[PDB]
Design a protein around this ligand. Structure first.
Ligand SMILES: Nc1ncnc2c1ncn2[C@@H]1O[C@H](COP(=O)(O)OP(=O)(O)O)[C@@H](O)[C@H]1O
Ligand SMILES: [Mg+2]
Length: 755
């Protein structure tokens, strides 16, 4: 890197030998032939209803006047009765008592920090307060409000659209990856932090916004950490941009310092007392204990809804059916009030999200009707369900973990932090004195649980982050002003990986491939695989595989019904090719037979998750549009062609050649090309005899090291496709890999001369 790296046939240029790079160059030239247009202009309504209001000199009183008026200032329409009822209710939120104090701070500072307990009205009200003082629409801009969580962004936008008496997708909208609900009319845009990051990649100054509100900063996601850095600089280049940092942690010092001694507004807490119940003994099996305590609460405690925290969608759906079924049994057998039960988790469709806010069912019984929401930690600080009085806290969540010594992420179910435990308990005290049932000991809470979780950036593989920073035009990656810097070595490794992928050249600059990959909301390996696929004559099939990989395991395997579940899977299963299996299932899911059969019944009878398949369907559609937009041809070859499956395996390889494992000759296990790790094929797939080399999607770390979602690949293909990576010079000494790598190359040379 110091002097220009030299390349040669023995140590080749990864960019020059990248098949996907070749595709990107073809696509780039096509685009350069018909340069795509610019963003459609924003549009707004102005009939003088804002006359008399002066930007940045607004008051709560003036705003209230408009809100109290008969006609909606942002539109031309009469305010509805629904609106007025919602209006008087939300005016009770703690944030309203400080509206004027907030405006003052907003008016006199470019950056401010805003802290308050969840439920106090931060996400719903504040951005509305800003619309009145900022009148962004009259100056041709919007205001962004960023959420770490998709569900918070979607549901809160739906609510705020109601609070503003406008249509969702119009004046108030949301933007999520693969799911956009905005238009030329949108003024207030709730969105994931990931999506604003992506907007910034296209427009470094985020010129479309006059105010950016980074919310739930206390979660310290990668995306908000990056946005905080970026915005700390953008703010020097645009005096017209205002920035609000919102957080639930009444801790602000560190944030204020980071943002050049920015001022702080704190909302006093209004939470009612919450009585804490602990288990006397350690609880080995929390699910059934959680279920038991929900039913006990419902049968014995007075009115008040229940919030149960679980860990993931499968577990949650399982608990929904068990609690639902036992609830019904309690009505008929003991005369309990009705008990409604709702799931909440990351992938829920919007309609279903909205169900959690439904009133508890009325009892015609004399015993209280009651709602149970069974939620992931979305319900920890990201949103509130009015009427919760009881929380059940098993003490676990799904957390990203990184391993520097093995260089790999993995999502594990792990004990929560004490701060998280505190937040969960707090949800019980929003409306009245509540109770929180912790499925662990008081000792464990006081001495075992870690105080605070580490920021995501310190628990992350940074290959996506590096490509993003590069796209943002950041050259000095080491000195990017992170609030908590990652270890330099994780960054270096990411740069190297991106170079091998040919997204960056050896001097750290974007290639045509890197530039194009940055246009897809996908991990670099996936985007590269997709980009190159038309060069392998199978972009239609790679399209579906990438969509299928962007979604949870689709196959349902009940513990008590394994045999039939497996029978069903084998209908689609491809030997030595889990990746092909995904293609089969999706193709069948889209079949006329399936549709004729009744799609939902079809998935159920086939042990398939309709929710995941439908999400894959939408993702495929959105990806196709990107491919049309950037001129990546949609390719396929005849299924009857001896090269069909070959092409697919090769395209997979072009992206995943660094996630390859070779069959251990002596130990009858597997060894990974990168880092030389001993691993076993995950139990969920059966290896065939001719599968000496496999490409794997995932590294799973239970008690042993497993490799999951594998497809066989010919070694000569790896060498042919990624010569720079499969150069024995950088290969450590012997075990089986280098050794049999040499053998492969020998065999390959030996074949040339004869002819
Ligand atoms: N669909 C909904 N989404 C969010 N909040 C709602 C919804 N329906 C009613 N509310 C009410 O409005 C408030 C939403 O507060 P929220 O602005 O999300 O605050 P914060 O962001 O500070 O946790 C809750 O206190 C609740 O009383
Ligand atoms: Mg909020």
């Amino acid at each position: 890197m110091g002097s220009k790296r030299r390349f040669s046939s023995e140590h080749p240029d990864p960019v020059e030998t990248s098949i996907p790079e070749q595709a990107a160059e073809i696509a780039e030239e096509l685009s350069k032939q018909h340069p795509l247009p610019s963003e459609e202009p924003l549009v707004h309504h102005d009939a003088g209803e804002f006359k008399g209001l002066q930007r940045h000199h607004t008051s709560a009183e003036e705003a209230q006047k408009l809100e109290d008026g008969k006609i909606n200032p942002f539109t031309g329409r009469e305010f509805t009765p629904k609106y007025v009822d919602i209006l008087k209710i939300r005016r009770e939120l703690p944030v309203h008592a400080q509206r004027d104090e907030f405006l003052k701070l907003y008016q006199n500072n470019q950056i401010m920090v805003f802290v308050g307990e969840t439920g106090s009205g931060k996400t719903t009200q504040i951005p509305q307060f800003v619309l009145f003082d900022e009148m962004p629409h009259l100056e041709n801009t919007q205001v962004a409000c960023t959420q770490p969580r998709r569900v918070a962004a979607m549901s809160v936008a739906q609510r705020v659209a109601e609070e503003m008496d406008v249509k969702l997708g119009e004046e108030v909208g949301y933007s999520i990856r693969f799911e956009n609900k905005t238009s030329n009319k949108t003024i207030l845009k709730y969105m994931t932090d990931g999506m604003l990051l992506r907007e910034a990649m296209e427009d470094h100054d985020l010129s479309r916004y006059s105010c950016i509100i980074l919310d739930e900063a206390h979660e310290r996601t990668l995306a908000t950490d990056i946005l905080m850095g970026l915005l700390k600089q953008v703010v020097k280049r645009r005096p017209d941009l205002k920035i609000i940092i919102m957080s639930a942690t009444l801790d602000a010092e560190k944030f204020q310092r980071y943002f050049n001694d920015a001022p702080l507004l704190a909302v006093p807490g209004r939470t009612y007392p919450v009585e804490l119940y602990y288990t006397p003994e350690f609880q080995r099996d929390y699910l059934d204990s959680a279920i038991r305590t929900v039913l006990q609460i419902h049968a014995t405690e007075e009115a008040g809804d229940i919030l149960l925290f679980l860990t993931g969608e499968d577990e949650i759906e399982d608990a929904v059916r068990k609690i639902s079924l036992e609830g019904d049994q309690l009505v008929r057998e003991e005369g309990c009030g009705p008990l409604s039960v709702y799931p909440l988790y990351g992938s829920l469709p919007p309609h279903q999200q909205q169900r959690i806010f439904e009133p508890a069912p009325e009892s015609h019984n004399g015993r209280p009707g009651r709602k149970v929401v069974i939620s992931t930690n979305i319900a920890e600080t990201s949103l509130t369900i009015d009427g919760i009085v009881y929380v059940v806290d098993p003490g676990f969540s799904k957390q990203k973990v990184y391993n520097p010594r093995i260089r790999v992420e993995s999502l594990l179910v792990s004990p929560i932090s004490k701060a998280s435990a505190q937040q969960r308990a707090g949800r019980a005290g929003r409306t009245r004195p509540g109770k929180c049932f912790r499925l662990y000991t008081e000792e464990a809470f006081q001495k075992e649980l870690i105080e605070q979780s580490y920021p995501e950036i310190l628990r992350s593989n940074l290959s996506s982050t590096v490509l993003e920073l590069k796209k943002l035009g950041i050259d000095d990656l080491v000195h990017f002003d992170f609030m908590d810097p990652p270890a330099p070595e994780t960054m270096m490794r990411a740069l190297e990986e991106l170079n091998y992928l040919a997204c960056l050249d050896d001097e750290g600059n974007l290639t045509p491939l890197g530039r194009l990959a940055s246009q897809f909301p996908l991990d670099p390996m996936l985007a590269v695989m997709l980009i190159g696929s038309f060069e392998f004559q199978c972009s239609q099939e790679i399209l579906t595989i990438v969509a299928m990989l962007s979604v949870p395991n689709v196959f349902i395997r009940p513990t008590k019904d394994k045999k039939r579940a497996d029978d069903a899977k084998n209908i689609f299963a491809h030997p030595d090719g889990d990746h092909i299996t995904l293609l089969n299932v999706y193709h069948a899911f889209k079949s006329d037979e399936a549709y004729e059969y009744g799609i939902h019944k079809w998935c159920r009878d086939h042990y398939l998750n309709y929710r995941s398949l439908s999400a894959a369907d939408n993702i495929r559609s959105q990806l196709e549009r990107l491919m049309n937009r950037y001129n990546l041809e949609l390719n396929t070859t005849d299924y009857e062609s001896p090269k069909y499956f070959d092409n697919i395996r090769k395209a997979l390889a072009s992206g995943f050649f660094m996630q390859v494992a070779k069959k251990r000759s002596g130990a009858k296990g597997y060894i990974t090309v990168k880092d030389n790790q001993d691993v076993l094929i995950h139990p969920s797939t059966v290896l065939g005899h001719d599968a000496e080399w496999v490409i794997y999607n995932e590294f799973v770390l239970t008690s042993k090291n497993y490799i999951r979602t594998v497809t066989s690949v010919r070694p000569e293909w790896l060498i042919e496709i990624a010569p720079a990576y499969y150069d024995l010079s950088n290969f450590q000494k012997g075990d089986v890999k280098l050794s049999l790598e040499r053998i492969k190359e020998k065999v390959d040379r030996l074949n040339e001369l004869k002819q």
